[PDB]
Amino acid sequence: IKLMKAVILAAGVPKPLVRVGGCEIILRTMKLLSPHVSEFIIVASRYADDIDAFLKDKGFNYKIVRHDRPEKGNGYSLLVAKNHVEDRFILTMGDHVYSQQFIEKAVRGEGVIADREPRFVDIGEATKIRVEDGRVAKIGKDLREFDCVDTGFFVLDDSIFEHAEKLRDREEIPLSEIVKLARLPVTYVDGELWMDVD
Amino acid sequence: IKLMKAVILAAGGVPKPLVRVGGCEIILRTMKLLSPHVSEFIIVASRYADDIDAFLKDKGFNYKIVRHDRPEKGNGYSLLVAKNHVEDRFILTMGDHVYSQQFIEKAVRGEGVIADREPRFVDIGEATKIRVEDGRVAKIGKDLREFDCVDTGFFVLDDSIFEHAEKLRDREEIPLSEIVKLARLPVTYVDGELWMDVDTK
Numbered sequence A: 001i002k003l004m005k006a007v008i009l010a011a012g013v014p015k016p017l018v019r020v021g022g023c024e025i026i027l028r029t030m031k032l033l034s035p036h037v038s039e040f041i042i043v044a045s046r047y048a049d050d051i052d053a054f055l056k057d058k059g060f061n062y063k064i065v066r067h068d069r070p071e072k073g074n075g076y077s078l079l080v081a082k083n084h085v086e087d088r089f090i091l092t093m094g095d096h097v098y099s100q101q102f103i104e105k106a107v108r109g110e111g112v113i114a115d116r117e118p119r120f121v122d123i124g125e126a127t128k129i130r131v132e133d134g135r136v137a138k139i140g141k142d143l144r145e146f147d148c149v150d151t152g153f154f155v156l157d158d159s160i161f162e163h164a165e166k167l168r169d170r171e172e173i174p175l176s177e178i179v180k181l182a183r184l185p186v187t188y189v190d191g192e193l194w195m196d197v198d
Numbered sequence B: 001i002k003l004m005k006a007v008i009l010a011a012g013g014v015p016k017p018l019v020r021v022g023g024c025e026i027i028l029r030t031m032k033l034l035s036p037h038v039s040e041f042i043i044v045a046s047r048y049a050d051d052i053d054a055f056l057k058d059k060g061f062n063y064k065i066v067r068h069d070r071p072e073k074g075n076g077y078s079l080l081v082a083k084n085h086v087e088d089r090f091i092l093t094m095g096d097h098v099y100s101q102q103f104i105e106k107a108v109r110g111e112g113v114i115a116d117r118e119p120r121f122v123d124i125g126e127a128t129k130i131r132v133e134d135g136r137v138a139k140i141g142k143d144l145r146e147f148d149c150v151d152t153g154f155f156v157l158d159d160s161i162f163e164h165a166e167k168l169r170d171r172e173e174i175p176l177s178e179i180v181k182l183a184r185l186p187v188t189y190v191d192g193e194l195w196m197d198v199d200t201k
Helices: A025-036 A048-055 A074-080 A100-106 A160-167 A175-182 B026-037 B049-056 B075-080 B101-107 B161-168 B176-182
Strands: A004-009 A037-044 A062-066 A089-093 A096-098 A111-115 A128-132 A135-140 A148-156 A186-188 A194-196 B004-010 B038-045 B063-067 B090-094 B097-099 B112-116 B129-133 B136-141 B149-157 B187-189 B195-199
Touching: A004 A025, A004 A074, A025 A037, A025 A048, A025 A089, A025 A096, A025 A100, A037 A048, A037 A074, A048 A062, A074 A160, A074 A175, A089 A096, A096 A100, A096 A148, A100 A148, A111 A128, A111 A135, A135 A175, A148 A186, A148 A194, A160 A175, B004 B026, B004 B075, B026 B038, B026 B049, B026 B090, B026 B097, B026 B101, B038 B049, B049 B063, B075 B161, B075 B176, B090 B097, B097 B101, B097 B149, B101 B149, B112 B129, B112 B136, B136 B176, B149 B187, B149 B195, B161 B176
Parallel strands: A004 A037, A004 A089, A037 A062, A111 A186, B004 B038, B004 B090, B038 B063, B112 B187
Antiparallel strands: A089 A148, A096 A194, A111 A148, A128 A135, A128 A148, B090 B149, B097 B195, B112 B149, B129 B136, B129 B149
């Protein structure tokens, strides 16, 4: 799997700086992604200065991209990262914890990384996915019919911005809405250790 | 392993026991996993006692909130405050720690401090470490230079713990690790299972 940029959504103590097992959430993700990543694009808002200060002495090649609309959602944060990426790129959440085993499989994937065997997360509370012909048909926390769970990890193409731009003029831009509109391919990474902190 | 009471230390924005990890509050995950082994939960709380009580009311568990107004005294004081709510062998756990079912199943069958010789998730450098001598705690702390295992924050205690905890009552801060050391607690190994602490500093 060739080197690519990794976009970390850290906008809207900040959640990326919460320590899980003695290590900040964002630091765990960056350490695990670093052998596969040329540059980290960290999209942040109010805590951009706090994250930048934390990361300064860490030894990673990173850029903080700031916006002023945390209320516009994760889909808006992806649109703000458009000019900082080209071709295939990793997209992840700054509030999710992933194991090395999860990361090693996920970086080799395409589209949304989905879990058919969630071992840690509560299925009822999780963002669910209904798959049709290896692509996202339905996505949401309240799906009644579903086959897998959204892990908040993605391997995206520049073609994602074509779908995200269609929602550019809306009040809230949910990332799940872009995923559905793009009919994103699904890659299964089953039963590996991953969890969200909220 | 016979039914016993479980003491959850939840004293000293959003309180740590109410932080959601994988869509479930930390304290709720621990209680759900402990519930088949536990007769009553004794939750030691301070500032957020009302918030925890209100959260737990509709959950279906048999629990009692034990309050104190000294969170600055530490976890060692929180355990001393639980003395009159327990008799004989009881479980002691932290409200900021996440444990798996596999961890809990082995941990409830243990004695003294549950320690991990193979930590798979937690950062060893940041963890509370333990140096063991003849199956008992010889040294304990976050800055040990010589150690063989990591403190999981899970314990199976006897009423004899209060005899050691009482010795430190007129102290400014009562660290739980200091009581553990003074008691020369036996160690039970639960290796490489899923467990982690949630903190900020």
